[PDB]
Paper text:
The native HIV-1 envelope (Env) spike is a heavily glycosylated trimer of gp120–gp41 heterodimers, which mediates viral attachment and entry. As the main antigenic structure presented on the virion surface, Env is the sole target of HIV-1 neutralizing antibodies. Among the gp120 supersites, the CD4-BS is the most conserved and less protected by the glycan shield, making it a primary antigenic target for vaccine development. By docking and mutagenesis studies, we previously demonstrated that certain antibodies to the CD4 supersite, such as VRC03 and VRC06, establish functionally relevant quaternary interaction with two neighboring gp120 protomers in the HIV-1 Env trimer, while others appear to make contact with a single gp120 protomer.
An extension of the CDR1 loop is instead present in VRC-CH31, another antibody that was partially sensitive to mutations in CD4-BS213. Some of these differences are apparent when comparing VRC01-class antibodies derived from different donors, such as the difference between the heavy-chain CDR1 region of VRC01 and VRC-CH31, with the latter possessing a unique insertion that allows recognition of CD4-BS2. We also tried engrafting of the CDR1 loop from VRC-CH31, which was shown to be functionally important, onto the potent bNAbs N6 and VRC07-523-LS.
Author numbering:
A (entry chain G): 184, 188 to 223
B (entry chain G): 128 to 135, 151 to 184, 188 to 309, 312 to 321, 321A, 322 to 398, 411 to 458, 465
C (entry chain L): 7 to 67, 67A, 67B, 67C, 68 to 95, 95A, 95B, 95C, ...
D (entry chain H): 1 to 82, 82A, 82B, 82C, 83 to 100, 100A, 100B, 100C, ...
Write the structure that this text describes.
Amino acid sequence: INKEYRLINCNTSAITQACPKVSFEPIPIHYCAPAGF
Amino acid sequence: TLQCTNVTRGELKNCSFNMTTELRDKKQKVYSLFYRLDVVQINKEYRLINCNTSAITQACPKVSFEPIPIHYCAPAGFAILKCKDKKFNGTGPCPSVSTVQCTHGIKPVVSTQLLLNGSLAEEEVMIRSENITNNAKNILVQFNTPVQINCTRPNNNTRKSIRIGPGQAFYATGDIIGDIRQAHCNVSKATWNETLGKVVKQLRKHFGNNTIIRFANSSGGDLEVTTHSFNCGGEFFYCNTSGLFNSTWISNNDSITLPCRIKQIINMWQRIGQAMYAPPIQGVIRCVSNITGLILTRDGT
Amino acid sequence: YVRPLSVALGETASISCGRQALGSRAVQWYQHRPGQAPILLIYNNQDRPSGIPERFSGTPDINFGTRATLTISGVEAGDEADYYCHMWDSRSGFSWSFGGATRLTVLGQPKAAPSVTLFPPSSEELQANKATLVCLISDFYPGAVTVAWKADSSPVKAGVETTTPSKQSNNKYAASSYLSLTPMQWKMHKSYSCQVTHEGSTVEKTVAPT
Amino acid sequence: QVQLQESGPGLVKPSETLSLTCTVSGGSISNYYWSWIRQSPGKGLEWIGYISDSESTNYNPSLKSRVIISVDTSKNQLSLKLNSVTAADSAIYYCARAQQGKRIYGMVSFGEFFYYYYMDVWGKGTTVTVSSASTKGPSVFPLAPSGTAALGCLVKDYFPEPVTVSWNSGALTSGVHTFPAVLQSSGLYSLSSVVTVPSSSLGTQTYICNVNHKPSNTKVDKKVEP
Ligand SMILES: *[C@@H]1O[C@H](CO)[C@@H](O[C@@H]2O[C@H](CO)[C@@H](O[C@@H]3O[C@H](CO[C@H]4O[C@H](CO[C@H]5O[C@H](CO)[C@@H](O)[C@H](O)[C@@H]5O[C@H]5O[C@H](CO)[C@@H](O)[C@H](O)[C@@H]5O)[C@@H](O)[C@H](O[C@H]5O[C@H](CO)[C@@H](O)[C@H](O)[C@@H]5O)[C@@H]4O)[C@@H](O)[C@H](O[C@H]4O[C@H](CO)[C@@H](O)[C@H](O)[C@@H]4O[C@H]4O[C@H](CO)[C@@H](O)[C@H](O)[C@@H]4O[C@H]4O[C@H](CO)[C@@H](O)[C@H](O)[C@@H]4O)[C@@H]3O)[C@H](O)[C@H]2NC(C)=O)[C@H](O)[C@H]1NC(C)=O
Ligand SMILES: *[C@@H]1O[C@H](CO)[C@@H](O[C@@H]2O[C@H](CO)[C@@H](O[C@@H]3O[C@H](CO[C@H]4O[C@H](CO)[C@@H](O)[C@H](O)[C@@H]4O)[C@@H](O)[C@H](O[C@H]4O[C@H](CO)[C@@H](O)[C@H](O)[C@@H]4O)[C@@H]3O)[C@H](O)[C@H]2NC(C)=O)[C@H](O)[C@H]1NC(C)=O
Ligand SMILES: *[C@@H]1O[C@H](CO)[C@@H](O[C@@H]2O[C@H](CO)[C@@H](O[C@@H]3O[C@H](CO[C@H]4O[C@H](CO)[C@@H](O)[C@H](O)[C@@H]4O)[C@@H](O)[C@H](O)[C@@H]3O)[C@H](O)[C@H]2NC(C)=O)[C@H](O)[C@H]1NC(C)=O
Ligand SMILES: *[C@@H]1O[C@H](CO)[C@@H](O[C@@H]2O[C@H](CO)[C@@H](O)[C@H](O)[C@H]2NC(C)=O)[C@H](O)[C@H]1NC(C)=O
Ligand SMILES: *[C@@H]1O[C@H](CO)[C@@H](O[C@@H]2O[C@H](CO)[C@@H](O)[C@H](O)[C@H]2NC(C)=O)[C@H](O)[C@H]1NC(C)=O
Ligand SMILES: *[C@@H]1O[C@H](CO)[C@@H](O[C@@H]2O[C@H](CO)[C@@H](O)[C@H](O)[C@H]2NC(C)=O)[C@H](O)[C@H]1NC(C)=O
Ligand SMILES: *[C@@H]1O[C@H](CO)[C@@H](O[C@@H]2O[C@H](CO)[C@@H](O)[C@H](O)[C@H]2NC(C)=O)[C@H](O)[C@H]1NC(C)=O
Ligand SMILES: *[C@@H]1O[C@H](CO)[C@@H](O)[C@H](O)[C@H]1NC(C)=O
Ligand SMILES: *[C@@H]1O[C@H](CO)[C@@H](O)[C@H](O)[C@H]1NC(C)=O
Ligand SMILES: *[C@@H]1O[C@H](CO)[C@@H](O)[C@H](O)[C@H]1NC(C)=O
Ligand SMILES: *[C@@H]1O[C@H](CO)[C@@H](O)[C@H](O)[C@H]1NC(C)=O
Ligand SMILES: *[C@@H]1O[C@H](CO)[C@@H](O)[C@H](O)[C@H]1NC(C)=O
Ligand SMILES: *[C@@H]1O[C@H](CO)[C@@H](O)[C@H](O)[C@H]1NC(C)=O
């Protein structure tokens, strides 16, 4: 702005803490086409 | 709590308040202009009108209030039946009928008293009602020739962003750049005279060739119904119409000008609980539109 | 107060108004030479009265934003005066005070040499037991001179009064200078001088009692 | 056309009523706006007040509590009565005709206009001094001359400003050059006029300077000759 600081996002965007039970692990995903495609 | 002073009659105010910044432990003494109709008393101490009734949500400044033609379509196995009868009133058996999959381009114009930008009537000017003998049923008169109305707010307003939180910016009315003037609307007094005549003609077919037909202004109610309420370039006008319905008709350049006020805290429909703040529109507002219909109400001569 | 401004002879002057308007404006311009009657140059933002040269021109407010400026093309030496901007506008109230005086000074005028004329004490005032020398200076530019009195060859500096250089009709300056003497101090001396130094040159005018 | 001329005491003691008048020539008094403006030394132009053609009073709030502008239509003459004068009230008082302009910017119907006044013709001016010191007449002493020659008149201690100098009651006008006064430390102004004169006419033509000091009601003349 001891020295006075501030989180980086405060002047641009609200901020949301990631729920600590969801995982960022890449899981193999398969894209499927509907019937008739 | 707002600290408001007049602006250098007494309609628009100049209000300074303590506001939250992007940091939760810091304030800021910002000022913003507000129309009279948006505040109430307790430097004089004021407050926004909605605070004691409803929360308030600022309209996103990228969505447009512009009526866009919408077409209603019926699903497969259903149909819509038009009515080609040029003189078809409200009910009855339509002689000429056609089937369509969707309706024509209907513009969802939210208006009051004067039906704007709508669809005209072919041949003669129609008049519709459930029971026209019932005074508690609005008469829906539809013109055949449009009478043009021109509206403008001439003040050169400016928009001012106020960061009230993380990612939260309230758009406030900064200041007026130049002359302070009245908002109003013009209609051609000649074209409005001949259109009231066309209306007064078909009004005799239901009430008598000898009885006299008189037009008066509203007799009471809220601002939305006592005035030609509508929206012009994004700002919600409320026009006095006493200059349009002040004629008495017997058995046998010109311009009318309407003093329109402006509001910002609007409840839109009749919901009490969901108010909307319309952000201020930069520049000079003027719009041109046709009054193609009317919504009258005979007194219970 | 006063705003200084300097243009050259025969150029164009751009006198900006002191207070800029908030709304539509109606600005009057006045020309006022000190110790004289004010002259109305422009009354409506651009309209001039009868008897004002075309080289004077004020800006009209066709579109808002353009500030009011008084334009003087081909500035003469006679255009040296105070210029007031009487600003009226729709937003501010009744404008009682005139503008801030802009004191225009024209540069590059012809440098003229003074004309010194020294008179001895008159016989009536000498007979009235009082002596007074009068040293009249006129037709000099730039209007700034220093006067130095001398008894024979010694400076005086005691009992002298000098006008500030006032401006003449011909756009040059003039100033008097009075040295008060006793009837015996003027008789007991051989000569009396009036050294008038203008710019970087002096002019001497001597007067003796005979 | 229309011209004005003021007239007044020229000297008024402190804490008193400063009367003044202004006679206009060549036009009716009750169909124009009239305005009073003073100009103190060092200060700017100060607008006193104005009276309409309907005889309506409106004064500068800087004064107001001391001003009362009147007007008599029997003549073409209107007055000005500043009271409780102090030292700062010394100024050249001017008399100017105001004309009304209506500046319309929006709708005349909603009143979107304002009124601006502009003064086009002015009075010559009237000097007014405030001082507890009494008036005092001058005393003209002749300055004798000696191709071209120069002669004049010395107007010694007088109070207050001004004095008017004429030569040959108005006949001698070419070559005249009156100088600004000089305020001595005694508190009195001393003025001097001088007329450049061709050298041959020194012994033939007669030269008399007419000096007048209005606050003392004194009209004096004198002769200049070697
Ligand atoms: C919806 O309906 C509404 C209502 O029906 C409608 O409202 C209308 O809105 C418009 C626009 O907003 C308004 O238009 C304005 O009109 C103003 C008034 O104009 C009238 O009056 C003036 C002055 O009249 C006096 O002087 C003239 C001589 O000049 C005399 O002849 C008059 O008789 C009169 O003098 C007597 O009366 C005085 C009292 O007023 C006394 O004091 C005086 O002693 C005398 O007794 C006239 O000049 C106008 O004439 C014009 O109109 C005729 C037809 O009537 C035309 O044919 C022609 O073009 C004439 O020019 C008119 O009669 C205008 O002043 C104003 O325009 C000025 O203001 C704007 C904004 O401030 C400026 O941007 C603009 O440029 C103009 O400024 C000029 O003028 C001023 C004043 O002189 C100058 O100071 C300024 O510097 C600038 O000068 C420049 O232009 C000059 C020419 O204009 C030029 O000469 C200069 O050299 C310089 O270049 C504006 O247009 C209108 O009033 C509303 N209607 C009503 C009834 O109120 C609305 O539009 C409708 N539509 C919507 C909302 O969409
Ligand atoms: C709604 O109400 C708000 C108040 O809540 C108004 O906002 C104020 O508006 C006034 C003008 O009306 C502003 O005052 C102006 O401030 C300018 C900024 O100068 C400041 O900073 C300098 C340092 O650079 C300091 O030296 C100075 O002292 C100030 O602190 C000044 O430049 C202006 O000066 C003008 O006026 C003075 C005296 O009148 C003259 O001598 C000058 O020559 C000059 O003409 C003036 O003082 C004020 O700053 C505004 N406040 C804020 C917080 O912005 C809105 O204007 C008002 N809006 C409407 C539409 O009514
Ligand atoms: C009734 O219908 C009228 C026409 O169908 C409506 O008028 C429309 O009003 C809106 C807003 O009031 C205008 O949109 C604005 O446009 C201007 C600039 O437009 C100009 O420039 C574009 C260039 O892209 C050009 O194509 C146009 O023709 C204009 O020359 C913008 O600055 C604004 O931000 C805004 O987008 C429409 O332009 C205008 N249409 C017409 C034909 O005038 C009227 O509002 C309707 N009435 C009601 C009560 O709803
Ligand atoms: C804005 O101006 C209006 C008009 O002058 C003011 O209204 C006055 O309000 C007081 C109450 O304080 C009343 O006693 C007066 O009778 C009102 N006058 C009129 C003509 O209605 C208003 O107070 C002003 N507002 C501010 C904040 O200054
Ligand atoms: C307001 O006026 C008329 C409606 O009667 C419209 O202008 C006409 O529009 C039709 C069809 O769009 C055209 O065939 C005509 O040529 C138009 N006439 C003129 C003179 O241009 C106008 O678009 C209407 N505006 C609305 C409904 O917003
Ligand atoms: C309304 O006001 C705005 C400014 O508040 C004006 O915008 C200016 O327009 C000119 C061009 O005419 C530009 O040079 C400026 O840079 C603009 N200013 C800003 C801040 O953007 C606008 O012209 C005004 N319009 C009217 C009709 O009065
Ligand atoms: C409403 O506004 C429209 C356009 O802004 C006006 O139509 C103009 O009328 C004049 C005079 O007849 C014509 O010279 C223009 O060509 C017209 N404009 C267009 C785009 O055609 C109309 O007169 C106004 N009507 C009212 C009642 O204010
Ligand atoms: C946010 O703050 C940073 C400080 O690092 C600054 O550089 C940036 O301009 C700011 N951005 C916005 C959108 O306010
Ligand atoms: C903001 O808070 C301070 C705190 O004392 C107060 O003095 C001031 O009046 C407040 N400002 C407004 C506009 O209410
Ligand atoms: C809200 O405040 C207004 C003040 O204008 C008052 O008249 C009204 O009764 C209040 N309404 C409610 C629901 O509290
Ligand atoms: C519509 O017309 C039919 C037949 O012409 C008639 O019976 C009916 O009453 C009319 N509607 C109204 C509201 O008058
Ligand atoms: C209707 O007109 C009357 C008289 O003309 C007036 O007193 C009343 O306020 C008007 N009502 C509206 C809503 O304009
Ligand atoms: C509408 O205008 C009339 C006169 O034009 C006025 O008497 C009336 O009060 C206005 N309506 C309202 C709600 O003020």
